[PDB]
Structure formats: C-alpha cells, structure tokens
Design a binder for these strands. Structure first.
Ligand SMILES: [Mg+2]
Ligand SMILES: [Mg+2]
Ligand SMILES: [Mg+2]
Ligand SMILES: [Mg+2]
Ligand SMILES: [Mg+2]
Ligand SMILES: [Mg+2]
Ligand SMILES: [Mg+2]
Ligand SMILES: [Mg+2]
Ligand SMILES: [Mg+2]
Ligand SMILES: [Mg+2]
Ligand SMILES: [Mg+2]
Ligand SMILES: [Mg+2]
Ligand SMILES: [Mg+2]
Ligand SMILES: [Mg+2]
Ligand SMILES: [Mg+2]
Ligand SMILES: [Mg+2]
Ligand SMILES: [Mg+2]
Ligand SMILES: [Mg+2]
Ligand SMILES: [Mg+2]
Ligand SMILES: [Mg+2]
Ligand SMILES: [Mg+2]
Ligand SMILES: [Mg+2]
Ligand SMILES: [Mg+2]
Ligand SMILES: [Mg+2]
Ligand SMILES: [Mg+2]
Ligand SMILES: [Mg+2]
Ligand SMILES: [Mg+2]
Ligand SMILES: [Mg+2]
Ligand SMILES: [Mg+2]
Ligand SMILES: [Mg+2]
Ligand SMILES: [Mg+2]
Ligand SMILES: [Mg+2]
Ligand SMILES: [Mg+2]
Ligand SMILES: [Mg+2]
Ligand SMILES: [Mg+2]
Ligand SMILES: [Mg+2]
Ligand SMILES: [Mg+2]
Ligand SMILES: [Mg+2]
Ligand SMILES: [Mg+2]
Ligand SMILES: [Mg+2]
Ligand SMILES: [Mg+2]
Ligand SMILES: [Mg+2]
Ligand SMILES: [Mg+2]
Ligand SMILES: [Mg+2]
Ligand SMILES: [Mg+2]
Ligand SMILES: [Mg+2]
Ligand SMILES: [Mg+2]
Ligand SMILES: [Mg+2]
Ligand SMILES: [Mg+2]
Ligand SMILES: [Mg+2]
Ligand SMILES: [Mg+2]
Ligand SMILES: [Mg+2]
Ligand SMILES: [Mg+2]
Ligand SMILES: [Mg+2]
Ligand SMILES: [Mg+2]
Ligand SMILES: [Mg+2]
Ligand SMILES: [Mg+2]
Ligand SMILES: [Mg+2]
Ligand SMILES: [Mg+2]
Ligand SMILES: [Mg+2]
Ligand SMILES: [Mg+2]
Ligand SMILES: [Mg+2]
Ligand SMILES: [Mg+2]
Ligand SMILES: [Mg+2]
Ligand SMILES: [Mg+2]
Ligand SMILES: [Mg+2]
Ligand SMILES: [Mg+2]
Ligand SMILES: [Mg+2]
Ligand SMILES: [Mg+2]
Ligand SMILES: [Mg+2]
Ligand SMILES: [Mg+2]
Ligand SMILES: [Mg+2]
Ligand SMILES: [Mg+2]
Ligand SMILES: [Mg+2]
Ligand SMILES: [Mg+2]
Ligand SMILES: [Mg+2]
Ligand SMILES: [Mg+2]
Ligand SMILES: [Mg+2]
Ligand SMILES: [Mg+2]
Ligand SMILES: [Mg+2]
Ligand SMILES: [Mg+2]
Ligand SMILES: [Mg+2]
Ligand SMILES: [Mg+2]
Ligand SMILES: [Mg+2]
Ligand SMILES: [Mg+2]
Ligand SMILES: [Mg+2]
Ligand SMILES: [Mg+2]
Ligand SMILES: [Mg+2]
Ligand SMILES: [Mg+2]
Ligand SMILES: [Mg+2]
Ligand SMILES: [Mg+2]
Ligand SMILES: [Mg+2]
Ligand SMILES: [Mg+2]
Ligand SMILES: [Mg+2]
Ligand SMILES: [Mg+2]
Ligand SMILES: [Mg+2]
Ligand SMILES: [Mg+2]
Ligand SMILES: [Mg+2]
Lengths: 110, 120, 117, 55
RNA sequence: AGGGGAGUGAAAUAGAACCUGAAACCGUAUGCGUACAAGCAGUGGGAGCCUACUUGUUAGGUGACUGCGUACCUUUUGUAU
RNA sequence: AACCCACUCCCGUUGAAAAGGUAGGGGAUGACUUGUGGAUCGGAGUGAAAGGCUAAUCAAGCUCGGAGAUAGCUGGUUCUC
RNA sequence: GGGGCUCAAACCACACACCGAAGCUGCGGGUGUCACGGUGACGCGGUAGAGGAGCGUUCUGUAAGCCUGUGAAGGUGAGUUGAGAAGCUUGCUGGAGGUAUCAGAAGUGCGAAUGCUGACAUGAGUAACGACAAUGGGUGUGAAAAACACCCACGCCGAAAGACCAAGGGUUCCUGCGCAACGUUAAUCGACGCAGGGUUAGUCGGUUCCUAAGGCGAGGCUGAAAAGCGUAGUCGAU
C-alpha cells in the first residue's frame, strides 16, 4: 500500500513543525485526525491538510478504506529560507532568516 | 501575596476595568447571549447579577440607582420591565457560562454568557 | 597551465575521515578535529605496542604466583628452583598450565622444590 | 555573558527532552456522536445533550 | 500553494530555482550500548549481544569492565597552560 | 508662553534615537531667533578662542594618482622517504 | 601519594632470591657506509640547517595512435598492493569524453595568516514585537476574523494628534480584480501586486517687465601657459 503526500515550502520552521509530527506517528488515521482538529498549534492546521489528502490519494488511486489505514511514516525536512534585514540600534543591521519546511505523511493498511 | 483577595486586574486601570464591565452588562441585557473571554465572563457575573436582584423591586429610588450603575436608558428600561419580573422567584444565578473553545487570533479561551430562561 | 585543487584535496580529506570512523562528535565529521584525532591515535598505538608486552608479563607472573602458593611455594622461590634444576619453560606457558593443566603444573612445582630451592 | 565553547548536538537535544506536547481530553457527544473538547460546547452547538447556540 | 495518478521521452530522483550533483548542517528507520557514574574522549586487553555465511582458530556492527593517557599551531630558556 | 538653548537627576547604553525622553532649568525687544539666495577652504578658510568648526571624518577634509611608498617589526608559508 | 604499619610494613649491619626500561640477548624483516666478489663488519633520536631519492595534479610531444553508449570523466561503497606520498580491480550513480610509456613545461599539493567569497551551525525557539489614549459587544463577508466594513457604547487630541500654503517627493490619488513576497502577528485589509481612470485658468502660482547681494563679462589691463580682475552690457528673488 503506502500512499504518500508531500507539502513543499510549508511556511513554518521545521523545529516548530516537528513537535506536532511526533504526536501522530504510528497512530491510526481515525484518531490522528481528532488530535489535530483540537490542537492549538499552527503546525497542526498545516499538517491536517497534508494527512487529509494522503487519505484521499489512498481512495481514488488505490481503492483503500479509511478504517484500515494508519500513519506509518511522517517526517519534516528543511526547505529554502528567505533572508531579510532588521535595523538595530546605532546604525547596525541584523540578518533575519525566514525558514520553511517539507511535510511528508504516508498512510498504509500494512 | 494575594491571600483571600477578590477581583481580577486584567491588565487594565480601575477606570478602564469599571467602564468595560458596564458595556458587557448593558450588551447582555439586550442580546441575552454574548461571547467573551472566559476570565472576563467570570468577573461579569459579579456585576450583572446584583443588577437583576435590584430590579425585582420597582421604585424611583431603585431605577435611579440602576441608572447610576448602567448609564444606559434602554438597559434600565429592559430591567424593571422584562427582567426582574421574569426572575421574580429565582434565588440567584440568573446567568449561565459555558466554555466554547479558543480564538484563532491568539488562542484565548472563550465562553458563552446567556440568561437562564431566554425566550429564544 | 592552471591547476585546480578540487579533486585531489577531496581524496586527501576522505582518507583521514575514514580512519576517524567511530569517534565522537566533530572527531568523526570535521576535518580539522579529525586530523588531530587520527595523529593522536597513532601515537598511542605505537606506544601501546610496547606496553602490551609489559602488561601480559605482569599478568603471567601474578598467576604463577597464585598457582605456586597452592602448592606451598612463592613465585620468587619457584623461579630460583626452576633455574637451579634445568627447567627453562616460559612464563607464558607456565601461566597456561597453572589454569588448565593443573596436574602438570604440580609436577613442575614439586620438581623445583626438590632442587632444594 | 556568552558561551566559551559551542554546545554539542547531544547537549542541546537533552535540553529539549521536556518539550513534548500533550493531548487534550476529547469526549464523544452521546446523542449524536460528534467529538468535542471535554467540558466545552460542541462545534455544532451541543452541550450535555441540548442545543444551546443554534449556530 | 503543493501533491497522488495518468500521459511525453532513451531517461522526469532530466519537471522548468530543471546536466553532474560533494561537504558542513538537519532528519526518519534498524542493530548494539547507555539512568551509583567523575577529566583531551583515544589506545592494549576484553565479555556479552546482533547480522551474514564458508557454522565457528571466519567476516561485519556495538564496546560492559579494565591498564596507560593534560588538543594543534606559533613564539620561546621553557606552555595542558 | 511660542521660539532658541542645554544646568541637574533618573531611564535608556544589543537604545524608540551613531547624542534622545520624562520631570525640574536659562534667555525670551535683543551683542535676539529664523526662511530664501549669495561669499570665503586644505598649510587654506572661519573662529566673543574650546585646537573649536570646514557634509556622523580635523594638531591640517575628502577623492584619484606617484604607489605594490618604506616597514632591521608582528603574522603566515601547502606532498613523501 | 593513600590504606594502614610497633620482637615493623621504621632504623643499623650481614646474606640469599626475585620484580623491574624502547638498555642487552633470541627470532623475523628494511635500510646507510666501507671492504671483498651476494656475503662481512660497523651504524640507523633529532630542531635550525646542508645533502640524496621520489609520488601526485594541469598542459604539450609520442597520438590521424590506444580506450570508450556492450558506457568516459566526475561522485559514492567494498576488496587488495607497496616503506611512504600512492597504485590497482570491481558494485551503484552518471551520461561523453579520457590519455598508456618515456620526455618537456609549470598559475604544481593548505588547517592556521583577528586570511578572502558563499553556505550552514551554537547562543535559542531565548531577547524583542517601537511611547502605558483603552477598549466591549452585535451583524456581514469570507476557506478561515482580536485587527476588514457597518451599528450601539466607551476612551484620547482639540494654539493639535484639526485645516491650509512653500520646500521636498513623484502617481503614493480613485475604481475593479488579488494575497505569494512587503506590513515586526493573522489578514478577506493596505501608502503592497495587476489593469483602467483621474489634474481643465485673461484674474491663482510661474513665464513675460524691473532690479539687491552676487555672477558672467565684447573691448580693456595684468599674468610662464591654464588664467585673474574688471568697463559697456545682461543675468540673478528672498
Ligand atoms: Mg539612524
Ligand atoms: Mg542564527
Ligand atoms: Mg479567595
Ligand atoms: Mg481617573
Ligand atoms: Mg584542501
Ligand atoms: Mg567510538
Ligand atoms: Mg559522517
Ligand atoms: Mg561555556
Ligand atoms: Mg574557548
Ligand atoms: Mg578562552
Ligand atoms: Mg537525534
Ligand atoms: Mg525546551
Ligand atoms: Mg538521478
Ligand atoms: Mg537547487
Ligand atoms: Mg547532455
Ligand atoms: Mg539537478
Ligand atoms: Mg550529502
Ligand atoms: Mg534511534
Ligand atoms: Mg555507592
Ligand atoms: Mg548501572
Ligand atoms: Mg562528567
Ligand atoms: Mg570529570
Ligand atoms: Mg578498549
Ligand atoms: Mg583492541
Ligand atoms: Mg567480532
Ligand atoms: Mg578504556
Ligand atoms: Mg587515568
Ligand atoms: Mg598561531
Ligand atoms: Mg613570550
Ligand atoms: Mg618569557
Ligand atoms: Mg588543560
Ligand atoms: Mg589549550
Ligand atoms: Mg608540560
Ligand atoms: Mg524651528
Ligand atoms: Mg552652543
Ligand atoms: Mg554639559
Ligand atoms: Mg545638562
Ligand atoms: Mg524627578
Ligand atoms: Mg522655560
Ligand atoms: Mg526639557
Ligand atoms: Mg533675567
Ligand atoms: Mg552656496
Ligand atoms: Mg570654492
Ligand atoms: Mg591639507
Ligand atoms: Mg590646550
Ligand atoms: Mg584653525
Ligand atoms: Mg564633522
Ligand atoms: Mg599632516
Ligand atoms: Mg589631496
Ligand atoms: Mg603596502
Ligand atoms: Mg615610488
Ligand atoms: Mg608560521
Ligand atoms: Mg599529505
Ligand atoms: Mg628485628
Ligand atoms: Mg624488554
Ligand atoms: Mg636496541
Ligand atoms: Mg637481529
Ligand atoms: Mg636520523
Ligand atoms: Mg639509536
Ligand atoms: Mg597530450
Ligand atoms: Mg552504468
Ligand atoms: Mg582532465
Ligand atoms: Mg566510474
Ligand atoms: Mg572505484
Ligand atoms: Mg563533443
Ligand atoms: Mg600524455
Ligand atoms: Mg598555489
Ligand atoms: Mg597544512
Ligand atoms: Mg580549506
Ligand atoms: Mg595558513
Ligand atoms: Mg601549518
Ligand atoms: Mg571574529
Ligand atoms: Mg582561515
Ligand atoms: Mg534555534
Ligand atoms: Mg537563556
Ligand atoms: Mg527568561
Ligand atoms: Mg520576553
Ligand atoms: Mg509594547
Ligand atoms: Mg522599547
Ligand atoms: Mg505598537
Ligand atoms: Mg468591534
Ligand atoms: Mg465579528
Ligand atoms: Mg488591537
Ligand atoms: Mg479630553
Ligand atoms: Mg514639485
Ligand atoms: Mg506604485
Ligand atoms: Mg488608497
Ligand atoms: Mg478590494
Ligand atoms: Mg505577515
Ligand atoms: Mg493564509
Ligand atoms: Mg496600490
Ligand atoms: Mg526683467
Ligand atoms: Mg551687478
Ligand atoms: Mg568676471
Ligand atoms: Mg577678452
Ligand atoms: Mg533682467
Ligand atoms: Mg529677470
Ligand atoms: Mg517672488
């Protein structure tokens, strides 16, 4: 089985997004969706759309069932970062890095 | 310490705090159901409940006292005419507070304040 | 003829970093720290090829000492008797008989006592 | 003040061993079957088996 | 936005920030070690466990316990300094 | 009072600010303050004079050339036996 | 040095044994010099420094050759070979070039120079989010609203935090459609993106007329040259 779904350039840092990703690893799809629907973290809203579409890919493309599935694999990679400038005191400039990440969720009946 | 102390500061001055709970109580008697933050909803029942008790006895002295505390002519009219007659035999507890969730903007716990026997 | 260093510099770093396998932290993944660890590991290896011969001889002696006293003799009195009779077996073989061939070690010990030493 | 030596990979990951998030208390509304937060109004408008806000 | 199929192609992990695509750096998975233990982090010795196969005088991974052990460069009469 | 100035305290010192702010403070019809246009400059200008100011630069501005000035002084100097 | 030590595990004489270095010997190898015609003997710590012998990289000849889409260079593992720099053979990736041997030429070998240029860590998910006039509900739109619009109610300025000229800026002005980036948060909003539109003078401000300070200046006077001063003149608003 093992259908995947990826979200590249997710506008959030990887360390922030990995705290949510550890909550759903190995859990069933039915209960992993509830845990994300009642979470205050912003990453839980981004990762809920990736998981919800990985289940859809298992339906149209592989004719699976929602009940059998579970989250076999989930990981968060880094991505491209935007580099900006922040003006500080006494004529000094700081570099700001706006980080992103790649979110990948795999579901499987196995 | 704050042993045995009552009240919530809510990061406002006393004039601001006193003025904000007048608006909430005046809005509550008109809409019968409002949505606010949970900490603010719990400090409102110490303001809006003593006003409903006062309206059970209608007299010039009581209406003047009610207008000094809710400086709204409609709220004084709503009391003494609709509430206080509806709650004429209720030994307190005229408003109900229910947790409803958290705001999107800053994740603040919200609530529903309503009157107990709403016509709805 | 301009010469570019990219290809021979990479093979030279990789030889050092392959010898630093199994080390801790930056000692196995950054070249500057890994080069010093590889050089230091070669100083110890050179020096411990000498200690290895010292540490094993001290181990054989301590075990002949224990085996001789079960037969009623100290290590120094055993070696004096062994040189006196004729016997010239190693310390490495004597320590092996003490553990395993205890009945052969007993015959050698009572041979050394019979030499009146 | 500032560090005299940079921290290692293991040192900074040991400090983050207390950063794991918790799970909320979710109940199932007995009449219908909606999942809500415990002691909170349902996303539909039900609490303890009664319409309260009618959306 | 981004993806899962399907099509084009000799090849899409050649998909437009597109030949090859290293290192620092950041992850997931498996094997072994690790919560009574003091120090340049290695080396001499060394048990147990895991895998492979020519089934143990073999190969690979880990390294409990233990002897010894105060980085490199420069400048100096002389530096763990 | 407006306006011009900067005597004191505290805050700020990675500042809201490469010289400020809040409280008090001095002059306030004059040797006053100010807008617009113009004149004087690098061993030269201007100075109720502090070696002060001349574009956040002054016991001799900035820029391009002589110019890769010179450095008996620090630092560094790359594969093997 | 510690435990601990009293007819000692202290001290004074005598005796026999043992431990103990990379010292010496045994065994197996490599080298320097000298001698003899492969043996023999004496050696082989080393900074500054002198002397001898080599490896590898880029280009040229050998080469109109040899290898290569039945897979070049490059990348990444494994195995093996030398005393070393290093060589050799193969799995996977890659997809078109490489250069035996012996010579010739060098932009010929990097860990350091508070070296130069890019990328990425630690501090750390830490400080901070820019005046302490102040916000509370309802409704609407929307995928989504503390922040957008509208309503009810609060606060703040009011010799300004209101209105208007000049300088300076340059389309920021209005409307429709948008939210990637910009906005120290979100955004459906914007001084942001795209596209359209918008500025009407005999009397307002310029130009035109006149000059101040000052500038330029036909001839002219001066000055190695560039040029300086200046007359008639003509520019120059405040
Ligand atoms: Mg500035
Ligand atoms: Mg950083
Ligand atoms: Mg109490
Ligand atoms: Mg007051
Ligand atoms: Mg290099
Ligand atoms: Mg190790
Ligand atoms: Mg590594
Ligand atoms: Mg430190
Ligand atoms: Mg340090
Ligand atoms: Mg230091
Ligand atoms: Mg880790
Ligand atoms: Mg933490
Ligand atoms: Mg590929
Ligand atoms: Mg790229
Ligand atoms: Mg091509
Ligand atoms: Mg590529
Ligand atoms: Mg890599
Ligand atoms: Mg693990
Ligand atoms: Mg203990
Ligand atoms: Mg233990
Ligand atoms: Mg420790
Ligand atoms: Mg320690
Ligand atoms: Mg060991
Ligand atoms: Mg070993
Ligand atoms: Mg083994
Ligand atoms: Mg050890
Ligand atoms: Mg030790
Ligand atoms: Mg140095
Ligand atoms: Mg010195
Ligand atoms: Mg000295
Ligand atoms: Mg030290
Ligand atoms: Mg040191
Ligand atoms: Mg020393
Ligand atoms: Mg002024
Ligand atoms: Mg002054
Ligand atoms: Mg002063
Ligand atoms: Mg002062
Ligand atoms: Mg004061
Ligand atoms: Mg004054
Ligand atoms: Mg002042
Ligand atoms: Mg006076
Ligand atoms: Mg001027
Ligand atoms: Mg001038
Ligand atoms: Mg000058
Ligand atoms: Mg002076
Ligand atoms: Mg002067
Ligand atoms: Mg200056
Ligand atoms: Mg000078
Ligand atoms: Mg000059
Ligand atoms: Mg120079
Ligand atoms: Mg010169
Ligand atoms: Mg040096
Ligand atoms: Mg080398
Ligand atoms: Mg005695
Ligand atoms: Mg020896
Ligand atoms: Mg020797
Ligand atoms: Mg020999
Ligand atoms: Mg020598
Ligand atoms: Mg010697
Ligand atoms: Mg050639
Ligand atoms: Mg191939
Ligand atoms: Mg080449
Ligand atoms: Mg190849
Ligand atoms: Mg190879
Ligand atoms: Mg070609
Ligand atoms: Mg050639
Ligand atoms: Mg060079
Ligand atoms: Mg070097
Ligand atoms: Mg380098
Ligand atoms: Mg260097
Ligand atoms: Mg060096
Ligand atoms: Mg520095
Ligand atoms: Mg450097
Ligand atoms: Mg961090
Ligand atoms: Mg801290
Ligand atoms: Mg803190
Ligand atoms: Mg803070
Ligand atoms: Mg603030
Ligand atoms: Mg501040
Ligand atoms: Mg603000
Ligand atoms: Mg509102
Ligand atoms: Mg609303
Ligand atoms: Mg706000
Ligand atoms: Mg006022
Ligand atoms: Mg203009
Ligand atoms: Mg524009
Ligand atoms: Mg506009
Ligand atoms: Mg619009
Ligand atoms: Mg934003
Ligand atoms: Mg959004
Ligand atoms: Mg615009
Ligand atoms: Mg005129
Ligand atoms: Mg004139
Ligand atoms: Mg003139
Ligand atoms: Mg003339
Ligand atoms: Mg004129
Ligand atoms: Mg004119
Ligand atoms: Mg005018």
């Amino acid at each position: 089985m093992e259908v995947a779904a990826k979200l590249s350039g997710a506008r959030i840092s990887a360390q922030k997004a990995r705290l949510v990703a550890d909550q759903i690893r190995g859990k069933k799809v039915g209960e992993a969706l509830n845990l994300l629907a009642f979470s205050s973290k912003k990453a839980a809203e981004i990762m809920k759309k990736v998981l919800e579409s990985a289940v859809a890919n298992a339906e149209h493309n592989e004719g699976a069932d929602v009940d059998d599935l579970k989250v076999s694999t989930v990981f968060v990679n880094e991505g491209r970062s935007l580099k900006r400038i922040m003006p500080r005191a006494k004529g000094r400039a700081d570099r700001i890095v706006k980080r992103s990440c790649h979110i990948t969720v795999k579901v499987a009946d196995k | 310490m704050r042993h045995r102390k009552s009240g919530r500061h809510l990061s406002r001055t006393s004039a601001h705090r006193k003025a904000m709970f007048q608006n909430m109580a005046v809005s509550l008697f008109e809409h019968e159901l409002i949505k606010t933050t949970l900490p603010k909803a719990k400090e409102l029942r110490r303001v809006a409940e003593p006003l409903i008790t006062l309206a059970k006895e209608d007299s010039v002295a009581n209406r003047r006292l009610a207008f000094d505390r809710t400086r709204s002519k409609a709220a004084v009219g709503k009391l003494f005419n609709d509430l206080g007659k509806r709650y004429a035999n209720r030994p307190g507890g005229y408003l109900r507070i229910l947790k409803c969730g958290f705001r999107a903007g800053d994740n603040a716990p919200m609530a529903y304040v309503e009157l107990v026997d709403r016509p709805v | 003829a301009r010469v570019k260093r990219g290809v021979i510099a990479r093979r030279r770093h990789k030889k050092i970093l392959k010898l630093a396998k199994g080390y801790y932290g930056a000692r196995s993944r950054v070249f500057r720290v890994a080069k010093q660890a590889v050089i230091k590991a070669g100083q110890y290896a050179y020096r411990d090829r000498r200690q290895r011969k010292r540490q094993f001889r001290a181990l054989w002696i301590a075990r002949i000492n224990a085996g001789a006293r079960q037969n009623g003799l100290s290590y120094s009195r055993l070696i004096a008797g062994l040189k006196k009779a004729a016997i010239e077996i190693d310390r490495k073989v004597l320590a092996d008989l003490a553990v395993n061939e205890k009945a052969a070690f007993t015959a050698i010990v009572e041979k050394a006592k019979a030499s009146l030493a | 003040a500032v560090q005299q030596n940079k921290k290692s990979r293991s040192a900074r990951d040991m400090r983050r061993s207390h950063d794991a998030l918790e799970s909320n208390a979710l109940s199932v509304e007995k009449s219908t079957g909606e999942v809500h937060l415990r002691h909170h109004v349902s996303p539909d408008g039900f609490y303890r088996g009664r319409k309260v806000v009618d959306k």
